[PDB]
Design a binder for this molecule. Structure first.
Ligand SMILES: [Mg+2]
Ligand SMILES: [Mg+2]
Ligand SMILES: [Mg+2]
Ligand SMILES: [Mg+2]
Lengths: 231, 231
């Protein structure tokens, strides 16, 4: 039917794929697609907020070569620095709370500052939680969470008997958020590329054909409608 | 183009969804769909072997209620007992090696025997590895692997520094198999429902619309063709 405003997913996760491809189709360097992709983030953040989404996890990843995803994980163009610097005022006004998951400790000093300022300035907002997965990988997340949990247990002198599914959820970088009911990936590529592998165990998947730069509010609504129709 | 016999995935994983739905459409009890689903397993096992697939992991799961997957995990009708008893001779002759992943220690004594006999009788085969995920869950698998790795490390008096991605792969129930290049799920439902969550980190996903009982050799080839076209 039409968009059911009373069944809007609390948490939508999106792999923003297509910036490079979009640029290449127009014989332009990837930076042009990176810029347009940034505009898509603004559009999607506003509409998500306006329809009731409470958590939005975005993973910047551009499929260049299907067999080389490692090149994207820590690539500068997958950073939301430009977005945060040019849209922060709006985020603040829109009651959006900025957060991040991933390994950011080794990012450029000026990058850490930009991200921290964004968080600090929106720390008190109570609306949509805009979560950027930066230099993130599900396997790396688990490996990291496993190491800590082990030390946390040994330090406290305990056995592995307390380790269960719930324990793991509370020790992932996503411990403060419910798992996404819906995972969307643009461009038509159908993989989760090591993104929230544990968290999307029960998520509904939607592989949207449009390139991230062309993805818009209308398309988002359509994805949620599909989500609602599939029950 | 056409099926490229030199680029056949080494490992295909399939969530055999649709047995219940298929039966319900025909106003028959699920057992009728369970039986036809068994015939699909035979068809798919033969063609997979005949085209060069080296590992085939099958997960019996029937989507009855999208919001209650726990009811399927340990349900008797998702056991391959009937399949193994009626097709073992063929498996032996076809040089197929039967294996399993999952928690089988608490299954009925007669069920454990049927599964063990199937394994024993095909233990020396060198062709397709037919892997049945029984009473299996990716999260449970990880929780279990994490517990052991911890004890294995403490017992040996070691720190968590040796724990990396590779270490985890070698301690999962799937340690002897390469990750699947392709994950297929029938019926049109698009979720991985806690199946091989770690292992499908980079897998290509194909959500085939046909119900498992209607899925056949032709459809499998088509899925692989799609896989090859998407590059
Ligand atoms: Mg980009
Ligand atoms: Mg803790
Ligand atoms: Mg069945
Ligand atoms: Mg070991």
């Amino acid at each position: 039917e039409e968009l059911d405003s009373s069944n809007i997913p609390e948490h939508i996760a999106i792999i923003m794929d297509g910036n490079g491809r979009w640029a290449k189709k127009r014989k332009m360097p990837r930076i042009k697609g990176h810029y347009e992709g940034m505009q898509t983030i603004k559009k999607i953040t506003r509409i998500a907020s306006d329809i009731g989404v409470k958590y939005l996890t975005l993973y910047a990843f551009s499929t260049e070569n299907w067999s080389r995803p490692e090149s994207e994980v820590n690539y500068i163009m997958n950073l939301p620095v430009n977005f945060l610097k040019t849209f922060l005022p709006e985020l603040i006004e829109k009651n959006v709370k900025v957060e991040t998951i991933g390994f950011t400790d080794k990012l450029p000093k000026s990058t850490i500052e930009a991200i921290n300022n964004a968080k600090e300035k929106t720390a008190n907002n109570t609306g949509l939680k805009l979560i950027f997965a930066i230099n993130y990988g599900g396997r790396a997340e688990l490996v990291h969470s496993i190491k800590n949990m082990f030390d946390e247990l040994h330090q406290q002198g305990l056995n592995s008997d307390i380790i269960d599914e719930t324990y793991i959820n509370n020790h992932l970088m996503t411990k403060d958020y419910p798992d996404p009911e819906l995972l969307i990936r643009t461009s038509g590529e159908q993989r989760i590329s090591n993104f929230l592998i544990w968290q999307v165990s029960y998520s509904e998947f939607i592989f949207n054909q449009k390139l991230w730069p062309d993805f818009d509010e209308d398309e988002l609504i359509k994805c949620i409608k599909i989500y609602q129709s599939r029950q």
